[PDB]
Every structure is written in structure tokens, then in C-alpha cells.
Amino acid sequence: NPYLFESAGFASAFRTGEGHLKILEKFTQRSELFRGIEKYRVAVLEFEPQSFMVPNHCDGEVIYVVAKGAGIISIAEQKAKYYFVLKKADVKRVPAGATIYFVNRDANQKLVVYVLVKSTNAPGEAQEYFSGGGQNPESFYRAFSSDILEKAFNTAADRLERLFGQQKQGPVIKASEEQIRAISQYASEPTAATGGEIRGPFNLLKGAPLFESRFGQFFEASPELFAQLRDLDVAVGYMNINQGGMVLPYYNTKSTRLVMVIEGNGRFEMACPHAGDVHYQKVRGNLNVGDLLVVPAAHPITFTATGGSNLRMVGFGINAQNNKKKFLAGKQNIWRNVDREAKELSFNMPGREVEEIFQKQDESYFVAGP
Ligand SMILES: O=C(O)c1ccccc1O
Ligand SMILES: [Cl-]
Ligand SMILES: [Cu+]
Ligand code: NA
């Protein structure tokens, strides 16, 4: 099964006592089937209580989704400073090359963010550039010659050796309660909101889901409605399947989805046709917290919640503009927009009987699972 990337298969670019980054392999290293998603990476960042990330920029465009906890993100640009508060299920776009850091200000709970990265240059390559730090993480200022740094900073070499030579604790480090309180104060300060500014986070569970029943909900932030997604042609979806529920089988017309488990457990089945006559392989598996599943566009799929909790999933939708979900069963489904004769011809069954079978399910979207 090339579609399922267990959390264990993720690579760990850094790990400290205060945090870690896990990132998926370039999808094209797994399979040539993934040439369509070559520009994209998925990562998980975790911060321990009272932690701070050394300032750095990512060369890729980034979307962060808060999976667990609470915190702050700050952004330092040439001509602007931002602070935003991050809560569970908030989503935040960070422009490529923006210098950022995070703070987990909570004393007890980890802050866990799931990350989509879209490359701009070579497909799928993603790198952090530590402006902060010194020895570990290595600051990029150490790449420049001393004669250059001295002129640039108008300072003697010995002050610069001290400046870039004392950080050794790695990319995520402890911050004191007091340091945190002071950053919290700077973050709560009112600013002048301009046009052209980086936009703050939006809650994915805000307002009305795109569809629901008693057994689940699908929320989505589409690129049509969110300018900070529009230029990447990305949608962010949130699937909340009630304990013991399922989503009815469906396909996305246009948009391949990179699906990460937030909470709970489940399983899935997908149909995949990837000259003799077309055959659809059964792609099947289980899902745990932190797993990634690639759901290619046009592929029929169902997710089943298993265990004693809801199955909660976030999906990064690519090529998302005008995407729709075609449901394959339930009251509201594609066959409602097919007339009798075509049902009859299609299944070689008298048409009224096809209608009867297709209308037995009075519920839509989500139902009691097997
Ligand atoms: O949009 C999807 O098909 C999807 C599926 C599972 C989880 C989140 C999602 O956005
Ligand atoms: Cl017939
Ligand atoms: Cu396929
Ligand atoms: Na017929």
C-alpha cells in the first residue's frame, strides 16, 4: 500500500528535549504514482510546554494546522512584525521565506502542528534557514566571512563570535515563565491592520460544516473563500466522524487529498485502477493518530471510525478550485441525478428496482458504520 504513510515512516530532521520535527519522504521516492504531488511535503512539529523555536524561515510556502494545544506564532519581515495566537484547529498560512518562531506558552500541554509545505523551486525540496542560533542549530550567519560580518554589523569580530557561539540547545528550547509572559504581553498589543498584510489564523470548525448528519461533519476552508489559500490552490478540510460512524463512499472530482489523523482510530477502503479491461484494486488499511493517507482525486473512498472515539482528520486538498464530493450512496448522491433508463441500462436491472435499492438509505453523508 503506497498510499498510507504511518507516523513511524516519517523522518526526524531534529529532535531536542523540548520539541521535534518529523517530515514525510518526498512522495516520488515512495512511488512514481505520486508525480502529481511531488511539490508537496507534510510534516508534524511538536513543542513541549514552555518552549520556543529558534527563528528560521522555510523556503517553501507553509500551512500550519494546530492539532493539539495552544501557542503563539511570530513573524518577522523586513517591513512588518506580527504575533498571532494559535488554538486547536486554527489554520495559518505563512508565506515562503518569512522568518518565524513559535512559543508554546502552556505549562502542561504539548503544542502539535501539522504542516503542509509547497515548494516554489525544485519540486518537493524543503529546508529551514536558521537566522537564530549559533552552534546548534547552526546559524547561517556563520557562513559569512568575519571580514564581511564585521563590516555588515559595524562591530568587532569578538562580539560576533560570542553572538553566534553560545546557542547549543538545538532548534526548540526552554523559555522561562517570565520570558513567556513578556512575549505574551508583546503579542497582546494592538497593531494597525493594513491591506496587503499577512492574514491571521482561521478556525476550521467555525460556522457551518459544508455537510453533516447525526453521524458526522465535514468542514472546509476553500481557496474560493480564503485568500491565504487561493494562490496555492489549496483547500483545508476537516472530517469529524462520530464514534461508530462512517462517511458514505464518495470521490473528490478534482482534488487529491493529503489526509492526516488528528484524533481517534479508524480504517479505510479505496478503489484504485492504478489493453485488458479496467480493474479496481481494493486499497485498505487502518488509521492512527499522526498517520498520513494520500487520497488521489477521482478515487472512491470510505473511512470508518473504530474504537471508542470520534475519528477526526484534516486533509490538505491540492488543485482544489471547484472540487466537489460525489457521494456514491445515501439520499443525496450522484444517482439522484441519473434517470431511470440510465440506471436500468447501467446495471441490467429493471429501473424501478435500481431506484428502490438506491433509496433504501434515507440518511446522507455519514451513517452508522459496520
Ligand atoms: O476532503 C476529503 O476528502 C478529506 C478526507 C478526509 C479528511 C479530510 C478531508 O479534507
Ligand atoms: Cl433490464
Ligand atoms: Cu489509483
Ligand atoms: Na436493459
Produce one character per residue of 136-157: b if its CB has 16 or more CB atoms within 10 Å, e if not.
ebebbbbeeeeeebeeeeeeee
**Ligand of minimum distance to the alpha carbon of 341:** 4
**At the fourth CATH level, which superfamily is domain 1-192?**
Jelly Rolls (2.60.120.10)
3-state secondary structure (DSSP) of residue 205: coil
- Three-state SS for 152? helix
Report d(CA 260, CA 5) in Å as an integer: 10
Contact predicate 342/352, CB 8 Å: no
If you measure from the C-alpha of residue 353 to the centroid of ligand 4, how many angstroms do you get, rounded to a whole number? Answer: 12
- What ligand is nearest to the CA atom of residue 278? 3
User: How far apart are alpha carbons 203 and 262 in whole angstroms?
Assistant: 15
Cβ atoms of 301 and 270 within 8 Å: the answer is yes
Residue type, 211: F
Q: 280 CA distance to ligand 4 centroid (A)?
A: 24
Q: Cα–Cα distances in Å, from 96 out to 5, 36, 61, 118?
A: 25, 21, 4, 9
This PDB structure is determined at a resolution in Å of 2.2
User: What does R_g of the chain's alpha carbons equal in angstroms?
Assistant: 24
Residues of the chain with CATH 2.60.120.10: 1-192, 193-370
Residue closest to 222 by CA, chosen among 209, 85, 348? 209
The answer to whether 58 and 127 are in contact (CB under 8 A) is yes
Which helix (H) or strand (E) segment holds residue 202: the answer is: strand 202-203
Q: Tell me if 101 sits within 8 A of 52, measured CB to CB.
A: yes
Closest to 104 measured CA to CA, from 132, 75, 76, 70: 70
Closest CA to 263 of 107, 114, 49: 114
Written as nine digits, the cell of 258 is 493529503
Distance from residue 352's CA to the centre of ligand 2 (Å):
10
Q: Are 164 and 141 in contact (CB under 8 A)?
A: yes
In the 8-state DSSP scheme, what is residue 249? P
Residues with CB under 6 A from ligand 1: 237, 239, 252, 257, 259, 295, 313-315, 317
313 Cα: distance to centroid of ligand 1 (angstroms)? 7
Q: What does the block give as the cell for 107?
A: 505549562
CATH class of 193-370: mainly beta
Q: Measuring CA to CA, which residue among 58, 112, 101 is closest to residue 290?
A: 112
3-class secondary-structure state, position 236: strand
Distance, CA 279 to ligand 3 centroid (Å)? 10
Of 204, 212, 257, 365, the one to substitute when testing ligand 1's pocket (max ligand atoms within 8 A of C-beta) is 257
3-state secondary structure of 252: strand
Q: Residue 113: how many CB atoms within 10 A of its CB?
A: 25
CB 93 within 8 A of CB 230: no
3-state secondary structure (DSSP) of residue 32? helix
Residue with cell 560570542: 162
CA of 360 to the centre of ligand 4 (A): 22
Q: Are 216 and 239 in contact (CB under 8 A)?
A: yes
* Ligand 1 atom with least separation from CA of 314: 8
Structure-determination technique: X-ray
Nearest to 332 by CA among 213, 221, 209, 218: 213
Here the contacts of 322-326 (C-beta below 8 Å, separation 24 or greater) are 322/253, 322/254, 323/222, 323/235, 323/252, 323/253, 323/254, 323/255, 323/297, 324/252, 324/253, 324/254, 325/211, 325/218, 325/250, 325/251, 325/252, 325/253, 326/250, 326/251, 326/253
CA distance 12 to 24: 9
Residue 170 half-sphere exposure, CB side, CA atoms within 13 Å? 14
Residue ranges of alpha helices (H) inside the chain are 27-30, 146-153, 157-163, 177-187, 227-230, 340-347, 351-359
State the Cα–Cα distance between residues 215 and 243, nearest whole angstrom. 8
CA-nearest residue for atom 4, ligand 1, is 315
> Which residues, 6 or more positions from 166, have their beta carbon under 8 angstroms from its beta carbon?
134, 135
Candidate of 254, 311, 313 to mutate for ligand 1, largest count of ligand atoms within 8 Å of Cβ: 313
Counting ligands in written order, the one closest to the CA of 256 is: 1
Neighbours of 23 (CB within 10 A): 17
Nearest protein CA to atom 8 of ligand 1, as residue: 315
Nearest atom of ligand 1 to the alpha carbon of 303: 6
Return the closest-CA partner of residue 256 out of 240, 269, 237.
237
Q: Is 257 helix (H, G, I), strand (E, B) or coil?
A: strand
Cα 85 to Cα 114: distance, rounded to the nearest angstrom: 16
- From the CB of residue 266, how many other CB atoms can be counted at a distance below 10 Å? 25
Residue 33 DSSP class? G
Which ligand is located closest to the Cα atom of residue 346?
4
Helices and strands (H and E) in the chain: how many: 7, 28
